[PDB]
Amino acid sequence: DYDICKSWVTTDEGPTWEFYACQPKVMRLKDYVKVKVEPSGITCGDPPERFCSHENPYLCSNECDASNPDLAHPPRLMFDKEEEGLATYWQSITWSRYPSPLEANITLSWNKTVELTDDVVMTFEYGRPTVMVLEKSLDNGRTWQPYQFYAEDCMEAFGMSARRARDMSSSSAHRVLCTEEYSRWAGSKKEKHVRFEVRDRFAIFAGPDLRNMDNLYTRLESAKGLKEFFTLTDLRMRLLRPALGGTYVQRENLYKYFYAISNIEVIGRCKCNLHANLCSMREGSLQCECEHNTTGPDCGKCKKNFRTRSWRAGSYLPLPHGSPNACAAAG
Numbered sequence: 001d002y003d004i005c006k007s008w009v010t011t012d013e014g015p016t017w018e019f020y021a022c023q024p025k026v027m028r029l030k031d032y033v034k035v036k037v038e039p040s041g042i043t044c045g046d047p048p049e050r051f052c053s054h055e056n057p058y059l060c061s062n063e064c065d066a067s068n069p070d071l072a073h074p075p076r077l078m079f080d081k082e083e084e085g086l087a088t089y090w091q092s093i094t095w096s097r098y099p100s101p102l103e104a105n106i107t108l109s110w111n112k113t114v115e116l117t118d119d120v121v122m123t124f125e126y127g128r129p130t131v132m133v134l135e136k137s138l139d140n141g142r143t144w145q146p147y148q149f150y151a152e153d154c155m156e157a158f159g160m161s162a163r164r165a166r167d168m169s170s171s172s173a174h175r176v177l178c179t180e181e182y183s184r185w186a187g188s189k190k191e192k193h194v195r196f197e198v199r200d201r202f203a204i205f206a207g208p209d210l211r212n213m214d215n216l217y218t219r220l221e222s223a224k225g226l227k228e229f230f231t232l233t234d235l236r237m238r239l240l241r242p243a244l245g246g247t248y249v250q251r252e253n254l255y256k257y258f259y260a261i262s263n264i265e266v267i268g269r270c271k272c273n274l275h276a277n278l279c280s281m282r283e284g285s286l287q288c289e290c291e292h293n294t295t296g297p298d299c300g301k302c303k304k305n306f307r308t309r310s311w312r313a314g315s316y317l318p319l320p321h322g323s324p325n326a327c328a329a330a331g
């Protein structure tokens with residue numbers, strides 16, 4: 001939708017461009033991400049360390065060794081292409097420091113404003129976390145805010161009630177919530193995925209089958225905060241407690257507790273303020289290819305000779321084609 005920024009047509013005075021509101025295509029945003037995993041030393045394998053392989057097989061004699069490619073689990077394995085039968089994953093050290101918390105931050109950076117268009121799916125291989133917060137930034141990691149909380153027990157963990165995104169109403173579609181859906185029981189079901197529900201929130205407007213896109217586009221234009229809720233320059237997974245298998249920690253086998261993430265899927269498009277339908281790597285980071293006489297990485301300002309009036313974003317409205325709201329040169 002909103003696929004073309006400009007057309008070359010002929011009116012009298014002859015040939016001229018006509019402009020339309022436009023946006024770039026949805027991308028596999030994990031293919032563009034830069035990752036940081038903290039604190040120092042959290043990645044397994046330096047020094048080599050064994051862990052239990054859910055087999056378990058009671059022995060627990062598998063090894064993570066950062067020095068051997070066959071046995072190493074660096075952060076880039078969270079984003080790779082996987083062939084059938086061969087999940088690859090980042091892996092933390094085991095909880096050998098228990099009762100000290102086992103905590104890891106995974107920061108996902110684009111150095112570019114992007115808009116999610118489907119769920120964020122974070123897939124864990126030996127148990128999802130019992131407690132984690134997904135945070136985002138809109139200013140390249142200068143400030144952070146909570147995006148969704150996750151806990152086996154939302155009250156105990158964060159003083160929050162247990163909710164679900166699909167339970168939110170039109171006025172609460174951008175509300176930050178705590179959910180127990182991906183964390184209560186973690187370690188025992190082998191469900192693997194923790195989600196940040198985007199599609200459920202779009203459904204608040206577009207219906208359960210997402211067929212009423214007209215109403216979602218209208219709300220995205222008009223509801224303050226709605227489009228921004230889906231926008232970010234960075235996400236951070238603040239992992240606070242690993243899977244427990246819905247039972248108490250077995251102190252004599254700390255080798256079964258660890259985080260292992262095989263894939264983080266982030267799907268969405270560059271934010272171009274309805275002024276670009278292409279966004280591409282330039283000077284090492286994504287930037288919109290701005291149309292409508294705009295400029296800046298998100299088409300958020302007017303080009304130097306086109307400053308006769310204030311910059312505006314393009315609009316989705318009126319439906320179906322919206323409005324380009326292009327910058328204007330004098331006269």
Ligand SMILES: *[C@@H]1O[C@H](CO)[C@@H](O[C@@H]2O[C@H](CO)[C@@H](O)[C@H](O)[C@H]2NC(C)=O)[C@H](O)[C@H]1NC(C)=O
Nearest residue numbers: 038039040102103104105106144236237238239
């Ligand atoms: C994960 O990221 C948060 C956010 O930066 C870290 O928070 C800092 O932690 C210490 C307490 O441990 C505070 O003194 C700082 O003020 C915190 N900064 C902020 C902005 O909150 C947290 O330490 C990180 N977790 C891990 C395990 O590294």
Ligand SMILES: *[C@@H]1O[C@H](CO)[C@@H](O[C@@H]2O[C@H](CO)[C@@H](O)[C@H](O)[C@H]2NC(C)=O)[C@H](O)[C@H]1NC(C)=O
Nearest residue numbers: 110111112282283284285286287288296297298
């Ligand atoms: C983040 O992205 C911006 C592009 O949007 C990069 O900014 C450019 O940096 C190059 C090389 O340093 C300069 O020649 C350009 O003039 C800069 N452009 C702008 C708009 O400032 C920036 O380096 C990237 N930052 C990081 C940390 O990767």
Ligand SMILES: [Ca+2]
Nearest residue numbers: 077078088262
């Ligand atoms: Ca992988």
Ligand SMILES: [Cl-]
Nearest residue numbers: 296297298300
């Ligand atoms: Cl901009």
Ligand SMILES: [Cl-]
Nearest residue numbers: 301302303304
């Ligand atoms: Cl300027």
